Amino acid sequence: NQYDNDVTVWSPQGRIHQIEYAMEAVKQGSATVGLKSKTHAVLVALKRAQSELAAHQKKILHVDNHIGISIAGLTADARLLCNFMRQECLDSRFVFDRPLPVSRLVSLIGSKTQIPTQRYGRRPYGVGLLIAGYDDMGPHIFQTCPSANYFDCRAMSIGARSQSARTYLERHMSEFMECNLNELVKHGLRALRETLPAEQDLTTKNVSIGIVGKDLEFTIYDDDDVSPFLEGLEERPQ
Amino acid sequence: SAGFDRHITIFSPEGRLYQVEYAFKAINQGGLTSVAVRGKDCAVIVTQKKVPDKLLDSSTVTHLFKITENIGCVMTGMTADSRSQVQRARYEAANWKYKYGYEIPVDMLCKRIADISQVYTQNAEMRPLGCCMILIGIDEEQGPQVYKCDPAGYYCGFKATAAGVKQTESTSFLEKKVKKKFDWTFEQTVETAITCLSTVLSIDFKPSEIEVGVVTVENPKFRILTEAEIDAHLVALAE
Amino acid sequence: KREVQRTMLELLNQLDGFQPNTQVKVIAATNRVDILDPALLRSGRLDRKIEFPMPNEEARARIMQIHSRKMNVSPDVNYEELARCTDDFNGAQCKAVCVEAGMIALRRGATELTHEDYMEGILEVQAKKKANLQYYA
Amino acid sequence: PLLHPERFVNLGIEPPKGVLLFGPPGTGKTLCARAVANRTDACFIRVI
Amino acid sequence: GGDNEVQRTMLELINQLDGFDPRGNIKVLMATNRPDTLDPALMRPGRLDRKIEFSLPDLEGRTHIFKIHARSMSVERDIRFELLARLCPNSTGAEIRSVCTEAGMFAIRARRKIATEKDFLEAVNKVIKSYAKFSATPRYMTYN
Amino acid sequence: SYDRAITVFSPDGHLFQVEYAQEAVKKGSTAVGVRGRDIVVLGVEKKSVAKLQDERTVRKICALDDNVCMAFAGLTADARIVINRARVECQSHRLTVEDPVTVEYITRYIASLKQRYTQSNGRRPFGISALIVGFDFDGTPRLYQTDPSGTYHAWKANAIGRGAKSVREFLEKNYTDEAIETDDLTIKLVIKALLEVVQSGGKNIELAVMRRDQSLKILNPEEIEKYVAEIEKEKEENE
Amino acid sequence: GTGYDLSASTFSPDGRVFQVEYAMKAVENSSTAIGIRCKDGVVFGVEKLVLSKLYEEGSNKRLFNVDRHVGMAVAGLLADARSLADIAREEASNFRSNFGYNIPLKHLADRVAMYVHAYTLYSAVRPFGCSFMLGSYSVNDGAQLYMIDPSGVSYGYWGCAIGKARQAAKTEIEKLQMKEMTCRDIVKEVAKIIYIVHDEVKDKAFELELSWVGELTNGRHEIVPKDIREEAEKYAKESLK
Amino acid sequence: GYSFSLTTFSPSGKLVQIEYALAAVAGGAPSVGIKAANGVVLATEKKQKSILYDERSVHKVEPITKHIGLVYSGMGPDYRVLVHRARKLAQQYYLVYQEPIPTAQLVQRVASVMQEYTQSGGVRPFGVSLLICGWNEGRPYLFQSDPSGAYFAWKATAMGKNYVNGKTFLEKRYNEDLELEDAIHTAILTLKESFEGQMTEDNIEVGICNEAGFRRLTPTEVKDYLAAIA
Amino acid sequence: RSEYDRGVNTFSPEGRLFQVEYAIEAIKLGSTAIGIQTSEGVCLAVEKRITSPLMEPSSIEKIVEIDAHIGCAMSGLIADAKTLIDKARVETQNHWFTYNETMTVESVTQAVSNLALQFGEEDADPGAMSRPFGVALLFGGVDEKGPQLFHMDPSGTFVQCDARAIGSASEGAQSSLQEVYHKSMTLKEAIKSSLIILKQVMEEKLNATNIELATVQPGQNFHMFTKEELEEVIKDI
Ligand SMILES: Nc1ncnc2c1ncn2[C@@H]1O[C@H](COP(=O)(O)OP(=O)(O)OP(=O)(O)O)[C@@H](O)[C@H]1O
């Protein structure tokens, strides 16, 4: 197939294959989940460990007081995007002195990621994101995509082995709204557990949490800070 | 031969720019036709308009453009490329008027467009813009003037010309007519053009099926003809 | 496109300008049709040609459902997602996906299949050998 | 599958009935084939 | 169409393998060095459901193969197999057998009764870093 | 992966283009260098004058600065360019910091230049492997050797060019603190080193000795003949 | 035809570009979007598809406001469309700044179209993969409607449909008397048209997006207010049964 | 294998693309140039594909300056391009030195610009060849230039289609010495040698380069010369 | 493989980005290095792997001093290592100048990574060369947070690791470390274990000139190469 090597060539069926390959790249990462009540947006991530000794990779990145990010896919693209995001939020605060609405930020990210799919000269950004924020219109959980397409998801999960997570979210999608913070977090990490294989179980080492609330600046919990949430969670069904 | 020299604008054994050659086939790809004629004191352009779907503002579909108050143009071939070339021509006419202080003679404008096309074909990284153009105007002390361009950058002045799919038959018929001795009065010119188009296509078109644009020495303004007037001319041609 | 030539001539004349009645019907299947002689199809000879397109995502999911009917599949499975992932596949490949997912489940001792099993099967049939590739967290 | 078809029948799973071994030369595919032939306890047929 | 005979033979083979009513108890194995040349008809699953790829053994596999081969040899117990397995980056078990034989022959040439690590590492140099390895081997002053 | 690109890796990981570049160096005339206790010497084959040609133009040993000398092996034009850049760099460095360049600094600079040319496509790496030597302030002998890949090293004594392998083996076998006791001993060491590979030419040798901190003086052929006579006399004596 | 379609800067022996042709084929596969023009204003109707049931309502809207007095409906690669929208919005902004009044729709539709066409002239950049419509209204000029395709040709329409079932939509639009109906009544029909061509069996759930412009909105573009879309949608279902 | 890019060398000979451009030049309208004792003459065939075309619209011999003519063979648009360039160069020289450009300098400048397009890249070389008249300093000049960038200096030549026959006839007829009128007769004769169809006052273009400035001949004069035998 | 290796601007059907796996493989042909972090400090051991007696052993620089409290060990292409080391030193000095303090180990590793990530951004710092770098680094240093050991890879990823081994023979060294390490180690014990592992891995018998060792502990500066102590350390073992 000679229609596959470049991103600026249309397939005879009307497709750009490099985009599908970036989709796969996003599939290459690990799992990640996001939920939102009326008040809080909670995004949970499962982080791998390259070896036993090394410390698990970071999966949640602090972007602003009201904006938090989970990544899956290429690390380089993740870091570049995170830098872009941080810079844009800072400029908005400097010029207007107000938090940047999540939707405008996601729109900017899409407009930036689109260009590499059009002009030959750089690969499409191969990283999928979960953006959890709180603005005047309450919480938001957006999900971007290497194709420069973004979605306003009420509860979404992306990454390797995320189908089970999505099915669980849909099944219990009804009551995610009125639930409090603790219940929301419990649902999120229960979904993540569902993504985990049968043997392994969630532990205070390989799970990280991020929360942005109506009155709560974005906070990242890892290691012992996560024990309060995990403890009390229902035993894994068998 | 062909097989290697058929992807970029570079020479071939028995020097042959195949790309510019393919541009002309692209021009024919439109599926239309046009005919221009030059009279004693007038010039006429005729084209066939094909609205295939009723849900379409017939006014918005047109192939006669006004390059300048006195200079009229008709385009043929790929639509978007023709529009781009038309815009370039308008720009060049405006620039000439601004810099030198008088309306651009038709021949010079045609030359400018030809030069642009030539520079495009010489250097790579730009498609040859496969659309052909015909210009009509009135030049003081020179009478009516008709000129034609081509994507290859060649241009020339004509006494009568055709473009599009039926170019060859139309031009043969026009030559047959021209070798005959006629005065070519305004009515005569329009009748000749419409007759040539009809005979080439054998259609006996209704008054909404074709567009006409004429420039006359009495009123150098390039005026697009209206349905009533074209219908009157057509019936008169039927006698 | 000489024994084979004689045989094809025999069959052709057998079906050529003969059997005006419809009491006898034949179906000929070809893996590829570019080496079959044009005389075969002709016009009044084999004009009935049935192209078989490449199964589509909906068709692929339907095929997996068909072949998985006997299997003990947990309802959670999402055939639509599997079809979306399984690009440029055929019925045989889908059947292989089903049977080999069943094999994976048996290997791990599972009583019933699961979406992850089908994903593993799809990755396996092409022999992709999925593994953690670093620089991808 | 040949020794204990009961397990396969339980889940209604069919043996592949055919395997293609491939890889760069010298891997041992022929070695593995002869090895399994040692413990086959059934008729094994090579080819020429 | 000079291959028509082999082609028809293969077509008969594949047809008898699968299609209509096969026996269903015929376990078929196939070994080819370059499957890419194989036709679509045979490679399509159903006829050949399983695909077992035999890749180059990893480090641990190489250590295991070294231990398996060398056990019969008469050698001092102090040799580090893992070192050797590392020294052969990507080599099939055939090369491991070759280096075992080469080390034994080196020992014989020295009129010795037991092989030592030196025998093994020079054998390795012979069977791997001596055929095509000679480019950056002397000018390794690029990697440190 | 393949070789027709500087900036492409291989499944093994090599950058084949630069490995190929090293062969050009390997194909040049031999050069040798040794670092004494108070003297630094280098010698070159520099053979085969073409009957009707001058020799003052064919230069293989050149002085970068009043306290740093250099001798190369590889493509001649590339050597010329590198030498010119090194000289300009030495003077500029003395301009910005009013201290003479230490040999290590200039070796690092040259290696960086070669690496930069190795960096990207559209630029062919230098097919040159130089050999720098000299003294710096505080008067410490030093010898450095660079490679087209952009890496450099310090040696007590080393050789490059064709037959550099045999010369290197001989040096490592013979180099000892005794051989460095006096200047003449080092000169004789280098002379015999070259003799081991330059055949019995004798007149196909050019030796540049930077005695401590005076100047890079090129030995007159007669002196080389004298030293060769001494070497042969000693060889006869020990036999 | 192979060997000639790897880039948009090459001509086929038959004399035609192929990348442009491929792009058009990439748009046809998109979901439908129809727009018809009433005497007093213009109406757009889009058939957005719902995926995964997890997307918040109104996700990735396919109706945009390039300007307060202009609209846009898109079909094809959404990512590309969004890029065009910002180009349009910028294009209108410059016009107002440079001249000082709302941009005529006919002119803007031309300027944006030129942009799309310019992307099918170079081998470095692929042609756009989205076809979109434009609509506006104003007392000075009256209702207007335009359509644009990847090739970059912009004709003005009385009723247009772009997407999978453009044929079925156009077929149904023809039997409406757009030349004389009031835009309020048009809305009811547009709902019916989409539902007729929806093909619920082979596409699953969908959301009906509707857009308004006309003297009913004082020459302003805004989505049809809820409780009107509800009425039309209720009627559309009724007509189906 | 090679002969696609104007950069790489053949594995023996020379670049090919330039040779192919020369070939394109060969298959063009006939042209003839005769350097007389006291002037220069240029002639070219100018036949339209039909009677519709206007023969007074586009010319093939053009004045670069008051005393430097120019005729071409090969493609036309390139001829327009480099005639414009040559006019620019002549004007620049006049501005700098306040003196009419001597012909040789113009020829070499034009050759430089022409070879400029043969350098690397996608910029294909000119597919035309030029003959230049000129009467500076008191003696006529006739130069030829080609896409290769080399410029010769002929006494009398003919290029384009069937140039071999023209060259043979030229070396047969023109000896060394003629006036402008006899040179014109020889030139029209040479064109007729290979010209197809009856020649008229409108089929061919003729220009002269004297000690009054280069000038193109009007249809009446060319008709007169065409008459009177020859 | 099946194509897609000719550049870093093309994905694969499985999404993998070749020309990065290959760069990772590149480091596999360097001399092994080991780094162990304990409460008392960070110890780095490396196999010098000399080739010819003539060459000065010091010229083979495998363990550089990034700063008074940050040391680095590299294994891969030498030129890439040199460029990265220079970047780290420059950026440390710049940070000290602007904020008048000593930069953390994590910050230095991340600053280097930001340069290592820019393969083909087309608007990168002068350290971008289209192809990825081919060197893996180990940074060890004592900062406000105690002793820290960070590992890098050409992809740009970096990670904290208490015990690590890189370069040719990294696999076996990692396997050993995984079973000899325990959080309550003492710097002397860590050094002895590192040496025992290293010598067990290398083919050549351990010698005072074979290896290079360095250590950084809270009280002391990095500038302790244990030069001429190597003899003592080895002969105790
Ligand atoms: N552990 C091992 N793994 C693999 N091969 C081994 C091993 N130990 C020894 N070998 C030798 O490796 C060789 C691999 O050859 P194999 O059995 O693949 O046949 P072959 O002649 O290589 O055919 P092909 O090249 O097509 O595989 C055998 O001769 C086998 O004895």
UniProtKB/Swiss-Prot annotation, chain A:
Primary location class: cytoplasm
One Gene Ontology biological process: immune system process
GO molecular function: lipopolysaccharide binding
Post-translational modification Phosphoserine, affected residues: S107, S174
Entries under SUPFAM superfamilies matching the protein: N-terminal nucleophile aminohydrolases (Ntn hydrolases) (SSF56235)
InterPro entries, alphabetized: Ntn_hydrolases_N, Proteasome_alpha, Proteasome_alpha-type, Proteasome_alpha1, Proteasome_asu_N, Proteasome_sua/b
Expression induction: Induced in breast cancer tissue (at protein level). Up-regulated in liver tumor tissues.
Highest taxon listed in the record's lineage: Eukaryota
Cross-link (Glycyl lysine isopeptide (Lys-Gly) (interchain with G-Cter in ubiquitin)): K112, K205
Keyword terms, alphabetized: Acetylation, Cytoplasm, Glycoprotein, Immunity, Isopeptide bond, Nucleus, Phosphoprotein, Proteasome, Ubl conjugation
GO cellular component: centrosome; cytoplasm; cytosol; extracellular exosome; nucleoplasm; nucleus; proteasome complex; proteasome core complex
Location(s), subcellular: Cytoplasm; Nucleus
Glycosylation site positions: S107
Similarity comment text for this entry: Belongs to the peptidase T1A family.
UniProt-listed PANTHER family: PROTEASOME SUBUNIT ALPHA/BETA
Subunit-structure text: The 26S proteasome consists of a 20S proteasome core and two 19S regulatory subunits. The 20S proteasome core is a barrel-shaped complex made of 28 subunits that are arranged in four stacked rings. The two outer rings are each formed by seven alpha subunits, and the two inner rings are formed by seven beta subunits. The proteolytic activity is exerted by three beta-subunits PSMB5, PSMB6 and PSMB7. Interacts with NOTCH3. Interacts with ZFAND1.
Protein name: Proteasome subunit alpha type-1
Species, as recorded: Homo sapiens (Human)
Curated annotation (Swiss-Prot), chain D:
Compartments where located: Cytoplasm
Binding site for ATP: G23, P24, P25, G26, T27, G28, K29, T30
Modification comment: Monoubiquitinated by RNF181. Phosphorylated. Dephosphorylated by UBLCP1 which impairs PSMC2 ATPase activity and disrupts 26S proteasome assembly.
Induction remarks: Expression is not cell cycle-dependent and occurs throughout the cell cycle.
Organism superkingdom: Eukaryota
Quaternary assembly: Component of the 19S proteasome regulatory particle complex. The 26S proteasome consists of a 20S core particle (CP) and two 19S regulatory subunits (RP). The regulatory particle is made of a lid composed of 9 subunits, a base containing 6 ATPases including PSMC2 and few additional components. Interacts with NDC80/HEC; this interaction is detected only during M phase. Interacts and SQSTM1. Interacts with PAAF1. Directly interacts with TRIM5.
Membership in a protein family: Belongs to the AAA ATPase family.
Task of the protein: Component of the 26S proteasome, a multiprotein complex involved in the ATP-dependent degradation of ubiquitinated proteins. This complex plays a key role in the maintenance of protein homeostasis by removing misfolded or damaged proteins, which could impair cellular functions, and by removing proteins whose functions are no longer required. Therefore, the proteasome participates in numerous cellular processes, including cell cycle progression, apoptosis, or DNA damage repair.
From Swiss-Prot, chain F:
Keywords: Acetylation, Cytoplasm, Glycoprotein, Host-virus interaction, Nucleus, Phosphoprotein, Proteasome
Native source organism of the sequence: Homo sapiens
Similarity section: Belongs to the peptidase T1A family.
Post-translational modification: Phosphorylation by ABL1 or ABL2 leads to an inhibition of proteasomal activity and cell cycle transition blocks.
UniProt GO MF annotations: identical protein binding
Key word Aminoacyl-tRNA synthetase present: no
Subunit text: The 26S proteasome consists of a 20S proteasome core and two 19S regulatory subunits. The 20S proteasome core is a barrel-shaped complex made of 28 subunits that are arranged in four stacked rings. The two outer rings are each formed by seven alpha subunits, and the two inner rings are formed by seven beta subunits. The proteolytic activity is exerted by three beta-subunits PSMB5, PSMB6 and PSMB7. PSMA7 interacts directly with the PSMG1-PSMG2 heterodimer which promotes 20S proteasome assembly. Interacts with HIF1A. Interacts with RAB7A. Interacts with PRKN. Interacts with ABL1 and ABL2.
Name used for this protein in its record: Proteasome subunit alpha type-7
Gene3D superfamilies: Glutamine Phosphoribosylpyrophosphate, subunit 1, domain 1 (3.60.20.10)
Main subcellular location: cytoplasm
Gene giving rise to this polypeptide: PSMA7
NCBIfam families per the UniProt record, alphabetical: PRK03996.1
Effect of Y152F: Displays impaired G1/S transition and S/G2 progression
Record has Cytoplasm as a keyword: yes
Induction, per UniProt: Down-regulated by the ribozyme Rz3'X. Up-regulated in colorectal cancer tissues.
UniProtKB/Swiss-Prot annotation, chain I:
Tissues expressed in: Expressed in fetal brain (at protein level).
UniProt keyword terms in alphabetical order: Acetylation, Cytoplasm, Glycoprotein, Nucleus, Phosphoprotein, Proteasome
Disulfide bonds: none
Primary location: cytoplasm
PROSITE patterns associated with the record: PROTEASOME_ALPHA_1, PROTEASOME_ALPHA_2
Gene Ontology biological process: proteasome-mediated ubiquitin-dependent protein catabolic process
InterPro entries: Ntn_hydrolases_N, Proteasome_alpha, Proteasome_alpha-type, Proteasome_alpha_type_5, Proteasome_asu_N, Proteasome_sua/b
Residues recorded as bearing Phosphothreonine in the entry: T51
One Pfam assignment: Proteasome
CDD domains: proteasome_alpha_type_5
One GO CC annotation: secretory granule lumen
Keyword Glycoprotein: yes
Subcellular location, record wording: Cytoplasm; Nucleus
Residues linked to a glycan: S194
Modified residues (Phosphoserine): S12, S52, S59
Induction: Up-regulated in colon cancer cell lines. Up-regulated in fetal Down syndrome (DS) brain (at protein level). May be the target of the transcriptional activator NFE2L2.
Entry-linked PANTHER family: PROTEASOME SUBUNIT ALPHA/BETA (PTHR11599)
Subunit structure: The 26S proteasome consists of a 20S proteasome core and two 19S regulatory subunits. The 20S proteasome core is a barrel-shaped complex made of 28 subunits that are arranged in four stacked rings. The two outer rings are each formed by seven alpha subunits, and the two inner rings are formed by seven beta subunits. The proteolytic activity is exerted by three beta-subunits PSMB5, PSMB6 and PSMB7. PSMA5 interacts directly with the PSMG1-PSMG2 heterodimer which promotes 20S proteasome assembly.
Similarity annotation: Belongs to the peptidase T1A family.
Protein name, as recorded: Proteasome subunit alpha type-5
Naturally occurring in which organism (per UniProt): Homo sapiens
Gene name as annotated: PSMA5
